Amino acid sequence: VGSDPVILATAGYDHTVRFWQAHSGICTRTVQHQDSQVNALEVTPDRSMIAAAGYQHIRMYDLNSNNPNPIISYDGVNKNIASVGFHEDGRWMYTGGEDCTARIWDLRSRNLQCQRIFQVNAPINCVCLHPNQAELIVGDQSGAIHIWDLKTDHNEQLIPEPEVSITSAHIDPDASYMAAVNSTGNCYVWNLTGGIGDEVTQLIPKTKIPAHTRYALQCRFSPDSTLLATCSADQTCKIWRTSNFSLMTELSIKSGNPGESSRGWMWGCAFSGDSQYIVTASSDNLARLWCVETGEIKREYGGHQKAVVCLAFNDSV
Amino acid sequence: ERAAKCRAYAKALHYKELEFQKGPTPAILESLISINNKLQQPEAAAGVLEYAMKHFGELEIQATWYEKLHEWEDALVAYDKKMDTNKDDPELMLGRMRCLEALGEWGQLHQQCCEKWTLVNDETQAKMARMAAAAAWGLGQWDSMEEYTCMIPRDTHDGAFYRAVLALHQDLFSLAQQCIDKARDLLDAELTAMAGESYSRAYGAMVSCHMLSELEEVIQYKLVPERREIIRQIWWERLQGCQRIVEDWQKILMVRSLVVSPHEDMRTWLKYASLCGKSGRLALAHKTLVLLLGVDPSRQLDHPLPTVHPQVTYAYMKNMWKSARKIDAFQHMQHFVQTMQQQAQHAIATEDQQHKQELHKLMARCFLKLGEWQLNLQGINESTIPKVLQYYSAATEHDRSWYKAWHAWAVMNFEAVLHYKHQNQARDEKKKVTEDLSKTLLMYTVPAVQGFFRSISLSRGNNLQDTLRVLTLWFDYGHWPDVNEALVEGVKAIQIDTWLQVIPQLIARIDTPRPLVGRLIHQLLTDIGRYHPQALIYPLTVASKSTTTARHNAANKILKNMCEHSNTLVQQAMMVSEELIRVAILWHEMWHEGLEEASRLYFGERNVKGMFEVLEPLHAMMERGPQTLKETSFNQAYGRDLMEAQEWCRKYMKSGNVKDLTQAWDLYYHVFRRISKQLPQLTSLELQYVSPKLLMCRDLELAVPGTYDPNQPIIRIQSIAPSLQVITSKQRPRKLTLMGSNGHEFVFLLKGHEDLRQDERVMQLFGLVNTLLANDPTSLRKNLSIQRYAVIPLSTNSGLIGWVPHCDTLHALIRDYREKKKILLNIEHRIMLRMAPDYDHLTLMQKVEVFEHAVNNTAGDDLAKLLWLKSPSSEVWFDRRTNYTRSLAVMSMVGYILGLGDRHPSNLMLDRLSGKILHIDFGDCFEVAMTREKFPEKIPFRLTRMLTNAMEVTGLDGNYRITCHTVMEVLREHKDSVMAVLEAFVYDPLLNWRLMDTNTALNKKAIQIINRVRDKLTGRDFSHDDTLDVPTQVELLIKQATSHENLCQCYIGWCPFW
């Protein structure tokens, strides 16, 4: 199940974490995650085990032992845990919580405690790690984005438009671009002054995309740095050219008549390694696989009883 | 026939709206403002226009919008913009002109008419005539009037009207006589031509008919020299009385101008100018005063003002302050006063006493402004304090009476005390210090006290604030003889009446440890005892049964003093209250709560020392022996078990066993199971079992609770109804009903275990807010009021609440509708759980979806729909809605300042006869509900989806928001009275307990709450730094009260989807 070269994971309000075989739609294994909805899923760089950020815990089921239950649970934090992220070298894990803290966990040791804590006023929705492993980008509900230098412990903060909750941020693998998406449904793009190694690492504003009228729920860059994907409460995943920042492909699930009252938000996405395909999480209980170029619905992974809020997607050798 | 015409309309609006429900078209939008207008519902329709703007910028040209929004001043500058950018465009000019004729800008209206006379447009030629006739009428130029009248057709009411004026100037009264009777008939027939769907031309016909009847008196003023006082009286009275917006009075005066020049009217035009300043048309107000001065728009700006007419100058000076130039304004005042006192002291040759007096009274007003303005320009500090105090005392001198003068002086003195106290807390934050502090505070306290006393006497009927203030000083000043002397002088001086307003506050300090303070209180209360007892017994009775010795001691003393006096009243009231507290929680009910508590401490907490404290008062309670049949029936079936269950507990006390203790709980759980069974059986109480004494009571001298007030003959407890329905609830409250000595019956809620003393002061606040709303003319225009209750506390546990008729809880009305229409009551709830079983723990983002999901698959109607089906007609449906929208808004704002939380669907209700809404349960006050740990309210007041729905379509734009600012404006104006009351029970010694619940000294906590409140009353409630004006703050509140993010967070019971 971590032995298949393609790990595809789905989580939601239905107390399971389901694993799928990408190319078929067959659900492989399914895992018990009770007493909470899953907020975020992320497969560890090591491909050994997957993390499930939820209500006041991060349970972590194993991809190699192909069977058991959580190897590691992390506790002692109140209010939700919104984002997870790992540092390339095996042992570090980051989290944004409703408790207004970004936290760094030593995976290679004991303690329900965490190695570090970074307080903010206002809950943290998303946390991601600059590819250089040196800085952690933190977005909160006030509309502030914090760059946390993991060396200098210097915090530096940036608000775009906000008096508006920034919902997710992400940063292209090539470290050229950073993107923040907020509850207005805007998408901000910054250029990266690659300071690094004896660092500066500045951000130069490039564009605001009027991506959506409704909440924008997540944003993500293709591994290529070619494309920017934006998921939203308008039941849509919009894929943007990084050359143009114009709309390339729109994936959506909006009925076919004004009187259907929605059914489903586009909660998340993950690109494929070759950036050819995109996975989609939705409140209509499905994950979906799309052709990024045609916007074809190349598959529909059905199983969850209740809504789907997370994906994880892995293509490593 | 006339009452039957609006019925046709109301019932058409109902559908016209229900149509707009299905799809907002500019078509409907047009026929909605129209029909709402015939229905002479102007402000509701004005809401419709707001929606017109914020969706279709599509009768276009922002100047045409500013014109329909009667905002001529905005439309004029927007029409200039649109004329200079574009070309001539004959219609742009017409609008540009209408803006002038409403603004009374005759100078520009006449010029704009002549200067542009190509006007190849012939309709443009026709409309042109009417305006440029009145324009020339305001500019004297009668030739110009005649020319432009010779172009107005004699068929129009307007054509016939302006002929009447031209004749009356050129003295042709037989012509003028006939022109009026024709203009009447040309307007009579015109009011049936546009038989409803007209402008404020049905309201402005009353402007023309007024002018026509006045213009017939102008005829009377030419021929008969002996109505020159009769006519001027009716002219003058039908003015202070009359209320017609600025614009109409211009015209009305212009009629009177044909006969009396402004310099003979003066008071008339100063009164008019006065109004132009309050409504905020200063540029106009000015031009009136410049004429009355007959001296420059003080273009010679560095020069002194002319003292020729002291009254007119004073107007100008404040018009100056209200205008931009206000350091300048302040200057001219200092000097103007100096010129005035010299114009008195010398120029008063004896045989001129009236001039002297009016001159001293004008000065007192000047001195008040001087103090007022000085404060505004400088603030409060060591340099202003003496000056304004001097300014005010000076004002006191020249008027002696005058509430305002004596008030201002006291408040200044009282803020001097505050300024220094609050400075010294600053000093102590970082012996000769205290000795100068005490000399300081003593120096300003005594006059403060003194001031408030003379101010109170001059109010009488309207002084709650001042009265409360006297108390702050009285209680706060742990009594230094100086202050005590001044108080005891005052107490003697001022009427007893006064203190009734304040009885709860006084009794809150019955047991003041400070000796010099207590004495006076007791004395005062006993004198309040002498005249109007009744106003005293109930409140004293509560106190006389108080765990705290001091309280019930000193309470009894006053009652004793009242027996040498009204003994059998003290005696009756004594027993009626006792018995009602027995009836409130029956013996077994107390055992039922006391057994639950004791099992939580023992079996759930290992607390036997807490447990013993729970049961022993219930054991000692019965130790007295049964006294009513119900107490004996209980005693038989449970007494023996319980008395021996305590036996085993008291064997354990000494043996320290656990097998001794386990025999007791064996017996204890036995009776619990017995009682629990019989509890849902309690659905009625009969007096003859429960309290016999109360059944016996016939024709008492005691007054029916909360009915006593002077003015009104005393209504007494003539008999108590034999049965009490027990409303089945968590606190099974009884529905007690009394028979009145006037005939009519009086119903009450007899509550068991809720400290009703808070809700009491809350009523007090509402009382005041009602007075304020009655006194603001706009609020009075719209009948705006709060529903208050009669809250008669009985103990810390119990009390009586006045029963309001014709009401069902919001929850009820819905529960019924849903069951009638076959909808599952809690459907939004079930839907939400079906979607997300873990709803309570979702991220905000996640919740908002689940919430929206529920909302989108359920009817938003119900309340709107059930209120239509209820209605017996359609006009009755319509006015019940007008009443609803307004009453709901009033409490929205009031509730906000009060910080009134917990507004779930069972805590508010709707009077099914008037349509008005009413709130119950005022426990969760101040931010409390939002500060709590579990499930914190984010809502400022329930402005929920079915409440919105039930209003007019275009609701929040219409009557709701309008009524919002109005209420809020009244509140901010009277921010001090409102705060007097609030401080009164934040710092109330017996009520601070509701702020140590932030856990589940207080000095600092109480400070916050009040600051929080002031912030709300000054528009600082949001951004610390901004000072938001009303409509902004209002808009902000609605926004917040409406946000899905806020609502999806509400505790589910609150029903954020209702």
Ligand SMILES: CC(C)n1nc(-c2cc3cc(O)ccc3[nH]2)c2c(N)ncnc21
């Ligand atoms: C039983 C339901 C319908 N109900 N609750 C009340 C009620 C009003 C009320 C007012 C308070 O200040 C404190 C508690 C209260 N409880 C009421 C009332 N005052 N009059 C008529 N019905 C009423």
